[PDB]
Amino acid sequence: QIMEPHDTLSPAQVDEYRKNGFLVQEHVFDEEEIELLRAEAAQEFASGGERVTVEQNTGIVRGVHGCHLYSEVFGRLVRSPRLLPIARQLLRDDVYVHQFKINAKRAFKGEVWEWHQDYTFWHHEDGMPAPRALSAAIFLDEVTEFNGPLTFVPGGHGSGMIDADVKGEGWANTLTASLKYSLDVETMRGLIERNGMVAPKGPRGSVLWFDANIPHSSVPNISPFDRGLVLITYNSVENKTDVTRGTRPEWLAARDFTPLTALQATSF
Template identity: 45%
Template sequence: MRLTDAQLKEFDETGYLFLPDCFSDAEVAVLREEAEKIYTEDREEVWREKSGAPRTAFAAHTYNEAFRRLGAHPRLVGPVCQLFGEPVYMHQFKINAKAPFDGEVWQWHQDYGTWARDDGMPEPRAMNIAVFLDEVMAINGPLMFIPRSHKSGVLEAGHDVQTTSYPLWTLDKETVTRLAEEGGIVAPTGKPGSVLMFHGNLVHASPPNITPYPRKIVYLTLCAVSNYIRKPTRPEWIAHRDFTPITPLADDALMELAEAKRQAAE
Protein backbone atom coordinates (compact mmCIF):
# COMPACT_ATOMS: atom_id res chain seq x y z
CA MET A 1 0.00 0.00 0.00
CA ARG A 2 1.32 3.43 -0.95
CA LEU A 3 0.17 6.80 0.33
CA THR A 4 -1.13 9.37 -2.14
CA ASP A 5 0.39 12.83 -2.53
CA ALA A 6 -2.62 14.25 -0.69
CA GLN A 7 -2.10 11.85 2.22
CA LEU A 8 1.61 12.67 2.41
CA LYS A 9 0.74 16.39 2.52
CA GLU A 10 -1.86 15.82 5.24
CA PHE A 11 0.61 13.85 7.34
CA ASP A 12 3.26 16.55 6.99
CA GLU A 13 0.83 19.29 7.97
CA THR A 14 -1.06 17.65 10.85
CA GLY A 15 1.37 14.97 12.07
CA TYR A 16 -1.06 12.09 11.72
CA LEU A 17 -3.09 10.14 9.16
CA PHE A 18 -6.28 8.12 9.65
CA LEU A 19 -6.83 5.15 7.33
CA PRO A 20 -10.30 3.57 7.75
CA ASP A 21 -11.17 0.03 6.66
CA CYS A 22 -7.53 -1.01 6.40
CA PHE A 23 -8.18 -4.52 7.75
CA SER A 24 -11.24 -6.72 7.30
CA ASP A 25 -13.51 -8.04 10.05
CA ALA A 26 -12.04 -11.52 9.59
CA GLU A 27 -8.48 -10.27 9.97
CA VAL A 28 -9.36 -8.24 13.06
CA ALA A 29 -11.22 -11.17 14.62
CA VAL A 30 -8.05 -13.28 14.60
CA LEU A 31 -6.03 -10.49 16.20
CA ARG A 32 -8.65 -9.71 18.84
CA GLU A 33 -8.92 -13.36 19.88
CA GLU A 34 -5.14 -13.68 20.20
CA ALA A 35 -4.89 -10.41 22.16
CA GLU A 36 -7.40 -11.64 24.72
CA LYS A 37 -5.38 -14.84 25.17
CA ILE A 38 -2.17 -12.88 25.70
CA TYR A 39 -3.76 -10.65 28.33
CA THR A 40 -4.53 -13.74 30.46
CA GLU A 41 -0.91 -14.94 30.42
CA ASP A 42 1.53 -14.50 33.27
CA ARG A 43 4.40 -12.95 31.32
CA GLU A 44 6.81 -10.13 32.12
CA GLU A 45 5.82 -8.49 28.84
CA VAL A 46 2.22 -8.00 30.05
CA TRP A 47 1.84 -4.86 32.19
CA ARG A 48 -1.28 -4.37 34.27
CA GLU A 49 -3.18 -1.46 35.75
CA LYS A 50 -3.11 -1.03 39.50
CA SER A 51 -6.51 -2.75 39.46
CA GLY A 52 -4.96 -5.83 37.79
CA ALA A 53 -6.65 -5.19 34.44
CA PRO A 54 -4.34 -5.48 31.40
CA ARG A 55 -2.70 -2.21 30.31
CA THR A 56 -0.25 -3.25 27.59
CA ALA A 57 1.40 -6.37 26.20
CA PHE A 58 4.85 -5.86 24.71
CA ALA A 59 6.64 -7.79 21.96
CA ALA A 60 3.71 -10.05 21.02
CA HIS A 61 5.16 -10.35 17.52
CA THR A 62 8.01 -12.43 19.00
CA TYR A 63 5.83 -15.13 20.58
CA ASN A 64 2.46 -15.06 18.77
CA GLU A 65 1.97 -16.03 15.12
CA ALA A 66 -0.91 -13.65 14.39
CA PHE A 67 1.02 -10.65 15.66
CA ARG A 68 4.21 -11.83 13.96
CA ARG A 69 2.29 -11.56 10.69
CA LEU A 70 0.82 -8.19 11.60
CA GLY A 71 4.30 -6.90 12.43
CA ALA A 72 5.42 -7.58 8.86
CA HIS A 73 2.19 -6.65 7.10
CA PRO A 74 2.68 -4.63 3.92
CA ARG A 75 -0.28 -2.34 4.65
CA LEU A 76 1.60 -1.10 7.73
CA VAL A 77 5.26 -1.41 6.81
CA GLY A 78 4.89 -0.01 3.29
CA PRO A 79 3.62 3.50 4.15
CA VAL A 80 6.30 4.03 6.82
CA CYS A 81 9.09 2.93 4.47
CA GLN A 82 7.62 5.31 1.91
CA LEU A 83 7.71 8.23 4.35
CA PHE A 84 11.25 7.55 5.56
CA GLY A 85 12.62 6.55 2.19
CA GLU A 86 14.39 3.49 3.57
CA PRO A 87 13.71 0.11 5.21
CA VAL A 88 12.45 -0.02 8.80
CA TYR A 89 12.89 -2.32 11.79
CA MET A 90 10.63 -2.97 14.78
CA HIS A 91 11.67 -0.70 17.65
CA GLN A 92 8.67 -1.59 19.80
CA PHE A 93 5.46 -3.61 19.52
CA LYS A 94 2.62 -3.39 22.00
CA ILE A 95 -1.08 -4.17 22.36
CA ASN A 96 -2.61 -1.45 24.53
CA ALA A 97 -5.84 -2.19 26.34
CA LYS A 98 -8.36 0.18 27.81
CA ALA A 99 -10.28 -2.38 29.84
CA PRO A 100 -13.96 -1.65 30.53
CA PHE A 101 -14.27 0.55 33.64
CA ASP A 102 -10.58 -0.02 34.59
CA GLY A 103 -8.56 1.41 31.68
CA GLU A 104 -6.39 4.20 33.07
CA VAL A 105 -5.09 7.43 31.56
CA TRP A 106 -2.06 7.80 29.32
CA GLN A 107 -0.71 11.26 30.13
CA TRP A 108 0.20 13.94 27.56
CA HIS A 109 3.53 13.04 25.97
CA GLN A 110 5.63 12.68 22.83
CA ASP A 111 6.83 9.20 21.96
CA TYR A 112 10.12 10.34 20.51
CA GLY A 113 10.93 12.05 23.81
CA THR A 114 10.98 8.61 25.44
CA TRP A 115 12.81 6.94 22.57
CA ALA A 116 15.53 9.59 22.69
CA ARG A 117 15.92 9.78 26.49
CA ASP A 118 15.54 6.08 27.35
CA ASP A 119 16.78 4.35 24.20
CA GLY A 120 19.29 6.70 22.62
CA MET A 121 17.40 7.11 19.33
CA PRO A 122 19.25 9.79 17.32
CA GLU A 123 16.38 11.41 15.38
CA PRO A 124 12.56 11.28 15.23
CA ARG A 125 12.72 8.94 12.24
CA ALA A 126 10.39 6.45 13.90
CA MET A 127 6.65 6.48 14.29
CA ASN A 128 3.71 4.54 15.58
CA ILE A 129 1.24 2.93 13.24
CA ALA A 130 -1.80 1.72 15.13
CA VAL A 131 -4.50 -0.85 14.36
CA PHE A 132 -7.90 -0.64 16.09
CA LEU A 133 -9.00 -4.04 17.41
CA ASP A 134 -12.21 -2.66 18.94
CA GLU A 135 -14.41 0.22 17.92
CA VAL A 136 -12.78 3.40 19.18
CA MET A 137 -15.44 5.83 20.31
CA ALA A 138 -15.42 9.30 21.82
CA ILE A 139 -16.44 7.72 25.14
CA ASN A 140 -14.10 4.73 25.65
CA GLY A 141 -10.69 6.33 25.99
CA PRO A 142 -9.71 7.33 22.43
CA LEU A 143 -6.31 8.68 21.48
CA MET A 144 -6.24 12.48 21.58
CA PHE A 145 -3.84 14.41 19.34
CA ILE A 146 -2.79 18.05 19.21
CA PRO A 147 -2.52 18.59 15.44
CA ARG A 148 0.70 20.20 14.17
CA SER A 149 2.39 19.83 17.57
CA HIS A 150 5.04 17.65 15.91
CA LYS A 151 6.47 20.82 14.39
CA SER A 152 7.47 22.05 17.87
CA GLY A 153 10.37 19.59 18.06
CA VAL A 154 11.28 17.70 21.23
CA LEU A 155 9.65 19.37 24.22
CA GLU A 156 10.85 19.47 27.82
CA ALA A 157 9.29 16.68 29.87
CA GLY A 158 9.28 15.23 33.35
CA HIS A 159 9.55 11.53 34.20
CA ASP A 160 6.24 10.50 35.78
CA VAL A 161 6.59 7.20 37.65
CA GLN A 162 3.63 7.72 40.00
CA THR A 163 0.42 8.41 38.07
CA THR A 164 -0.03 5.00 36.45
CA SER A 165 1.58 1.58 36.41
CA TYR A 166 3.76 2.58 33.44
CA PRO A 167 6.48 5.29 33.70
CA LEU A 168 6.26 8.02 31.06
CA TRP A 169 8.03 11.24 30.07
CA THR A 170 5.12 13.68 30.34
CA LEU A 171 4.46 17.31 29.42
CA ASP A 172 3.36 19.96 31.90
CA LYS A 173 -0.06 21.60 31.85
CA GLU A 174 1.25 24.93 30.59
CA THR A 175 2.88 23.35 27.53
CA VAL A 176 -0.21 21.31 26.67
CA THR A 177 -2.45 24.36 27.11
CA ARG A 178 -0.27 26.48 24.81
CA LEU A 179 -0.13 23.82 22.11
CA ALA A 180 -3.88 23.15 22.33
CA GLU A 181 -4.61 26.86 21.91
CA GLU A 182 -2.53 26.78 18.73
CA GLY A 183 -3.68 23.49 17.20
CA GLY A 184 -6.77 22.32 19.06
CA ILE A 185 -7.37 18.73 20.14
CA VAL A 186 -8.80 15.90 18.03
CA ALA A 187 -9.76 12.33 18.89
CA PRO A 188 -9.94 10.10 15.79
CA THR A 189 -12.59 7.41 16.14
CA GLY A 190 -13.50 4.47 13.97
CA LYS A 191 -14.43 0.85 13.65
CA PRO A 192 -12.14 -2.16 14.15
CA GLY A 193 -9.60 -2.47 11.35
CA SER A 194 -8.98 1.25 11.09
CA VAL A 195 -5.36 2.41 11.17
CA LEU A 196 -3.72 5.54 12.59
CA MET A 197 -0.16 6.58 11.86
CA PHE A 198 1.41 9.50 13.67
CA HIS A 199 4.70 11.36 13.92
CA GLY A 200 7.04 10.54 16.80
CA ASN A 201 6.87 14.14 18.08
CA LEU A 202 3.08 14.51 17.89
CA VAL A 203 1.74 15.35 21.37
CA HIS A 204 -0.94 12.88 22.41
CA ALA A 205 -2.72 11.26 25.35
CA SER A 206 -5.80 9.19 26.14
CA PRO A 207 -8.35 9.52 28.94
CA PRO A 208 -9.55 6.70 31.23
CA ASN A 209 -12.18 4.27 30.01
CA ILE A 210 -15.09 4.25 32.46
CA THR A 211 -17.53 2.66 30.00
CA PRO A 212 -18.49 -1.02 29.53
CA TYR A 213 -16.83 -0.95 26.08
CA PRO A 214 -13.26 -2.23 25.60
CA ARG A 215 -10.70 -0.34 23.52
CA LYS A 216 -7.73 -2.37 22.29
CA ILE A 217 -5.17 -0.91 19.87
CA VAL A 218 -2.01 -2.55 18.49
CA TYR A 219 0.98 -0.24 18.03
CA LEU A 220 3.91 -1.00 15.75
CA THR A 221 6.77 1.41 16.37
CA LEU A 222 8.71 1.31 13.12
CA CYS A 223 12.12 2.97 12.98
CA ALA A 224 14.32 3.77 9.98
CA VAL A 225 17.17 1.26 10.00
CA SER A 226 19.80 4.02 9.86
CA ASN A 227 18.22 5.54 12.99
CA TYR A 228 18.76 2.48 15.23
CA ILE A 229 18.98 3.10 18.98
CA ARG A 230 22.45 3.76 20.43
CA LYS A 231 22.07 3.66 24.23
CA PRO A 232 19.17 1.43 25.30
CA THR A 233 18.32 1.41 29.00
CA ARG A 234 15.07 -0.58 28.89
CA PRO A 235 14.60 -4.35 28.52
CA GLU A 236 15.00 -5.79 25.02
CA TRP A 237 11.34 -6.74 24.90
CA ILE A 238 10.43 -3.05 25.31
CA ALA A 239 13.12 -1.50 23.09
CA HIS A 240 14.32 -4.09 20.59
CA ARG A 241 17.98 -4.53 19.62
CA ASP A 242 17.33 -6.47 16.42
CA PHE A 243 17.81 -3.86 13.69
CA THR A 244 17.17 -6.23 10.81
CA PRO A 245 15.01 -4.58 8.11
CA ILE A 246 11.48 -5.97 8.05
CA THR A 247 10.67 -8.00 4.96
CA PRO A 248 6.94 -7.49 4.31
CA LEU A 249 4.80 -10.62 4.00
CA ALA A 250 2.10 -11.22 1.42
CA ASP A 251 -0.99 -9.05 1.73
CA ASP A 252 -3.17 -12.08 2.57
CA ALA A 253 -0.95 -13.24 5.46
CA LEU A 254 -3.63 -12.66 8.10
CA MET A 255 -6.44 -14.09 5.97
CA GLU A 256 -4.37 -17.21 5.44
CA LEU A 257 -4.13 -17.63 9.21
CA ALA A 258 -7.83 -16.92 9.66
CA GLU A 259 -8.72 -19.61 7.13
CA ALA A 260 -6.41 -22.11 8.81
CA LYS A 261 -8.09 -21.44 12.16
CA ARG A 262 -11.54 -21.85 10.58
CA GLN A 263 -10.62 -25.18 9.07
CA ALA A 264 -9.11 -26.39 12.34
CA ALA A 265 -12.34 -25.55 14.16
CA GLU A 266 -14.51 -27.59 11.75
Protein backbone atom coordinates in the same frame (compact mmCIF):
# COMPACT_ATOMS: atom_id res chain seq x y z
CA GLN B 1 -0.28 -17.67 -4.76
CA ILE B 2 -1.23 -13.86 -4.98
CA MET B 3 -1.08 -11.00 -2.31
CA GLU B 4 -2.67 -7.68 -3.34
CA PRO B 5 -0.03 -5.32 -4.88
CA HIS B 6 1.46 -3.01 -2.23
CA ASP B 7 -0.68 0.13 -1.72
CA THR B 8 0.81 3.36 -0.65
CA LEU B 9 -0.56 6.63 0.53
CA SER B 10 -1.63 9.36 -1.91
CA PRO B 11 0.42 12.51 -2.06
CA ALA B 12 -2.47 14.30 -0.23
CA GLN B 13 -2.50 11.63 2.44
CA VAL B 14 1.25 12.07 2.88
CA ASP B 15 0.79 15.87 3.12
CA GLU B 16 -1.91 15.49 5.70
CA TYR B 17 0.20 13.14 7.71
CA ARG B 18 3.15 15.55 7.62
CA LYS B 19 1.03 18.67 8.45
CA ASN B 20 -1.10 17.05 11.22
CA GLY B 21 1.31 14.32 12.51
CA PHE B 22 -1.40 11.64 12.17
CA LEU B 23 -3.70 10.02 9.58
CA VAL B 24 -6.50 7.45 9.77
CA GLN B 25 -7.12 4.76 7.19
CA GLU B 26 -10.52 3.08 7.65
CA HIS B 27 -11.21 -0.62 7.29
CA VAL B 28 -7.73 -1.78 6.49
CA PHE B 29 -8.47 -5.11 8.18
CA ASP B 30 -11.87 -6.91 7.91
CA GLU B 31 -13.85 -8.49 10.70
CA GLU B 32 -12.48 -11.95 10.51
CA GLU B 33 -8.93 -10.56 10.54
CA ILE B 34 -9.71 -8.38 13.53
CA GLU B 35 -11.16 -11.36 15.33
CA LEU B 36 -7.92 -13.30 14.74
CA LEU B 37 -5.94 -10.33 16.13
CA ARG B 38 -8.26 -10.12 19.11
CA ALA B 39 -7.82 -13.85 19.98
CA GLU B 40 -4.07 -13.56 19.72
CA ALA B 41 -4.06 -10.36 21.85
CA ALA B 42 -5.95 -12.29 24.53
CA GLN B 43 -3.37 -15.18 24.45
CA GLU B 44 -0.59 -12.70 24.90
CA PHE B 45 -2.32 -11.04 27.87
CA ALA B 46 -2.75 -14.43 29.42
CA SER B 47 0.75 -15.70 28.76
CA GLY B 48 2.98 -12.60 28.59
CA GLY B 49 4.18 -12.79 32.22
CA GLU B 50 6.54 -9.87 32.91
CA ARG B 51 5.66 -8.34 29.49
CA VAL B 52 2.09 -7.57 30.74
CA THR B 53 1.32 -4.35 32.66
CA VAL B 54 -1.86 -4.11 34.96
CA GLU B 55 -4.04 -1.15 36.00
CA GLN B 56 -3.14 0.40 39.42
CA ASN B 57 -6.75 0.69 40.86
CA THR B 58 -8.10 -2.69 39.69
CA GLY B 59 -5.24 -5.03 38.62
CA ILE B 60 -6.98 -5.28 35.24
CA VAL B 61 -4.80 -5.75 32.10
CA ARG B 62 -3.37 -2.31 30.89
CA GLY B 63 -0.73 -3.41 28.31
CA VAL B 64 1.24 -6.28 26.73
CA HIS B 65 4.67 -5.53 25.13
CA GLY B 66 7.04 -6.96 22.49
CA CYS B 67 4.55 -9.51 21.16
CA HIS B 68 5.96 -9.64 17.64
CA LEU B 69 9.06 -11.39 19.12
CA TYR B 70 6.88 -14.11 20.67
CA SER B 71 3.86 -14.60 18.50
CA GLU B 72 3.99 -15.95 14.98
CA VAL B 73 0.78 -14.06 14.19
CA PHE B 74 2.16 -10.72 15.37
CA GLY B 75 5.57 -11.42 13.69
CA ARG B 76 3.68 -11.74 10.42
CA LEU B 77 1.41 -8.69 11.08
CA VAL B 78 4.28 -6.27 11.21
CA ARG B 79 5.34 -7.45 7.69
CA SER B 80 1.80 -7.11 6.29
CA PRO B 81 1.52 -5.54 2.80
CA ARG B 82 -1.15 -3.30 4.42
CA LEU B 83 1.45 -1.78 6.79
CA LEU B 84 5.09 -2.22 5.77
CA PRO B 85 5.02 -0.41 2.40
CA ILE B 86 3.43 2.62 4.09
CA ALA B 87 6.02 2.58 6.98
CA ARG B 88 8.73 2.46 4.35
CA GLN B 89 7.19 5.29 2.28
CA LEU B 90 6.64 7.65 5.32
CA LEU B 91 10.04 7.00 6.85
CA ARG B 92 11.72 6.94 3.40
CA ASP B 93 13.83 3.96 4.28
CA ASP B 94 13.78 0.30 5.06
CA VAL B 95 12.27 -0.16 8.48
CA TYR B 96 12.20 -2.41 11.54
CA VAL B 97 10.03 -2.58 14.64
CA HIS B 98 11.33 -0.57 17.60
CA GLN B 99 8.36 -1.45 19.81
CA PHE B 100 5.10 -3.39 19.70
CA LYS B 101 2.29 -2.98 22.26
CA ILE B 102 -1.33 -3.88 22.71
CA ASN B 103 -3.09 -1.26 24.97
CA ALA B 104 -6.31 -2.84 26.25
CA LYS B 105 -8.03 0.31 27.59
CA ARG B 106 -10.79 -1.78 29.04
CA ALA B 107 -14.35 -0.67 29.39
CA PHE B 108 -15.18 1.02 32.70
CA LYS B 109 -11.78 0.64 34.35
CA GLY B 110 -9.27 1.56 31.64
CA GLU B 111 -6.98 4.25 32.97
CA VAL B 112 -5.51 7.46 31.58
CA TRP B 113 -2.50 7.97 29.33
CA GLU B 114 -1.01 11.38 30.25
CA TRP B 115 0.22 13.78 27.61
CA HIS B 116 3.56 12.77 26.06
CA GLN B 117 5.65 12.55 22.93
CA ASP B 118 6.88 9.00 22.20
CA TYR B 119 10.27 10.14 20.85
CA THR B 120 11.09 11.64 24.31
CA PHE B 121 11.07 8.18 25.81
CA TRP B 122 12.74 6.41 22.86
CA HIS B 123 15.47 9.08 22.72
CA HIS B 124 16.31 9.15 26.49
CA GLU B 125 15.53 5.58 27.41
CA ASP B 126 16.60 3.77 24.22
CA GLY B 127 19.12 5.98 22.47
CA MET B 128 16.95 6.75 19.42
CA PRO B 129 18.96 9.48 17.73
CA ALA B 130 16.25 11.31 15.72
CA PRO B 131 12.48 11.26 15.65
CA ARG B 132 12.44 9.35 12.26
CA ALA B 133 9.86 6.81 13.47
CA LEU B 134 6.14 6.26 13.58
CA SER B 135 3.40 4.16 15.04
CA ALA B 136 0.50 2.39 13.37
CA ALA B 137 -2.36 1.78 15.81
CA ILE B 138 -4.77 -0.87 14.74
CA PHE B 139 -8.34 -0.58 16.19
CA LEU B 140 -9.55 -3.88 17.57
CA ASP B 141 -12.78 -2.06 18.64
CA GLU B 142 -14.58 0.90 17.08
CA VAL B 143 -13.05 4.12 18.38
CA THR B 144 -15.67 6.79 19.43
CA GLU B 145 -15.69 9.94 21.40
CA PHE B 146 -16.73 8.00 24.51
CA ASN B 147 -14.19 5.15 24.89
CA GLY B 148 -11.03 7.08 25.65
CA PRO B 149 -9.82 7.71 22.18
CA LEU B 150 -6.22 8.48 21.44
CA THR B 151 -5.96 12.27 21.29
CA PHE B 152 -3.54 14.59 19.57
CA VAL B 153 -2.52 18.22 19.25
CA PRO B 154 -2.39 18.44 15.46
CA GLY B 155 0.82 20.02 14.14
CA GLY B 156 2.21 19.69 17.64
CA HIS B 157 5.21 17.82 16.29
CA GLY B 158 6.57 20.91 14.56
CA SER B 159 8.61 21.74 17.57
CA GLY B 160 10.45 18.54 18.23
CA MET B 161 11.12 17.29 21.73
CA ILE B 162 9.59 19.41 24.47
CA ASP B 163 10.66 20.04 28.07
CA ALA B 164 9.36 17.15 30.20
CA ASP B 165 10.25 16.59 33.87
CA VAL B 166 11.86 13.24 34.50
CA LYS B 167 10.63 11.22 37.45
CA GLY B 168 12.28 8.19 39.00
CA GLU B 169 15.12 5.89 38.19
CA GLY B 170 14.60 2.72 36.09
CA TRP B 171 11.83 2.05 33.54
CA ALA B 172 8.70 0.36 35.19
CA ASN B 173 7.07 3.88 35.13
CA THR B 174 7.42 4.25 31.27
CA LEU B 175 4.28 2.06 30.89
CA THR B 176 2.14 3.47 33.82
CA ALA B 177 -0.76 5.92 34.37
CA SER B 178 1.85 8.17 35.98
CA LEU B 179 4.52 8.55 33.24
CA LYS B 180 8.29 9.18 33.71
CA TYR B 181 8.24 12.06 31.12
CA SER B 182 5.15 14.10 30.66
CA LEU B 183 4.20 17.65 29.66
CA ASP B 184 3.73 20.44 32.32
CA VAL B 185 0.27 22.09 31.86
CA GLU B 186 1.60 25.12 31.09
CA THR B 187 3.57 23.56 28.33
CA MET B 188 0.40 21.71 27.26
CA ARG B 189 -2.23 24.47 27.84
CA GLY B 190 -0.34 26.66 25.37
CA LEU B 191 -0.07 23.93 22.72
CA ILE B 192 -3.78 23.28 23.05
CA GLU B 193 -4.62 26.97 23.00
CA ARG B 194 -2.63 27.42 19.78
CA ASN B 195 -3.38 24.16 17.88
CA GLY B 196 -6.46 22.54 19.44
CA MET B 197 -7.03 18.85 20.05
CA VAL B 198 -8.31 16.04 17.81
CA ALA B 199 -9.35 12.49 18.65
CA PRO B 200 -9.69 10.54 15.36
CA LYS B 201 -12.54 8.02 15.27
CA GLY B 202 -13.01 4.91 13.19
CA PRO B 203 -14.51 1.48 12.91
CA ARG B 204 -12.77 -1.80 13.78
CA GLY B 205 -9.83 -2.56 11.48
CA SER B 206 -8.89 1.04 10.91
CA VAL B 207 -5.22 2.03 11.24
CA LEU B 208 -4.25 5.29 12.80
CA TRP B 209 -0.71 6.38 11.81
CA PHE B 210 1.15 8.90 13.93
CA ASP B 211 4.44 10.68 14.30
CA ALA B 212 7.01 9.85 16.95
CA ASN B 213 6.91 13.46 18.12
CA ILE B 214 3.17 14.39 18.02
CA PRO B 215 1.78 15.07 21.52
CA HIS B 216 -0.99 12.70 22.39
CA SER B 217 -3.03 11.47 25.31
CA SER B 218 -6.11 9.50 26.24
CA VAL B 219 -8.72 9.92 29.03
CA PRO B 220 -10.01 7.08 31.21
CA ASN B 221 -12.44 4.72 29.53
CA ILE B 222 -15.41 4.65 31.87
CA SER B 223 -17.69 3.54 29.00
CA PRO B 224 -19.02 0.05 28.60
CA PHE B 225 -16.94 -0.47 25.42
CA ASP B 226 -13.37 -1.76 25.27
CA ARG B 227 -10.88 0.22 23.15
CA GLY B 228 -8.13 -2.33 22.23
CA LEU B 229 -5.27 -0.83 20.10
CA VAL B 230 -2.40 -2.86 18.59
CA LEU B 231 0.42 -0.26 18.32
CA ILE B 232 3.32 -0.97 16.00
CA THR B 233 6.23 1.38 16.17
CA TYR B 234 8.28 1.36 12.95
CA ASN B 235 11.75 2.89 12.94
CA SER B 236 14.02 3.81 10.01
CA VAL B 237 16.96 1.32 9.94
CA GLU B 238 19.34 4.21 9.29
CA ASN B 239 17.88 5.70 12.51
CA LYS B 240 18.61 2.51 14.52
CA THR B 241 18.93 3.12 18.24
CA ASP B 242 22.31 3.27 19.92
CA VAL B 243 22.30 0.16 22.08
CA THR B 244 25.32 1.54 24.01
CA ARG B 245 22.83 4.09 25.42
CA GLY B 246 19.90 1.66 25.84
CA THR B 247 18.38 0.78 29.26
CA ARG B 248 15.35 -1.46 28.66
CA PRO B 249 14.71 -5.06 27.65
CA GLU B 250 14.34 -6.22 24.01
CA TRP B 251 10.54 -6.51 24.41
CA LEU B 252 10.37 -2.73 24.92
CA ALA B 253 13.28 -1.46 22.71
CA ALA B 254 14.41 -3.77 19.85
CA ARG B 255 18.12 -4.62 19.21
CA ASP B 256 17.78 -6.53 15.97
CA PHE B 257 17.80 -3.95 13.17
CA THR B 258 17.31 -6.36 10.17
CA PRO B 259 15.20 -4.60 7.48
CA LEU B 260 11.72 -5.97 7.38
CA THR B 261 10.47 -7.68 4.18
CA ALA B 262 6.85 -8.11 3.14
CA LEU B 263 4.85 -11.29 3.65
CA GLN B 264 4.44 -13.28 0.43
CA ALA B 265 1.58 -15.59 -0.43
CA THR B 266 2.24 -19.25 0.41
CA SER B 267 0.06 -22.34 0.30
CA PHE B 268 0.13 -22.34 4.10
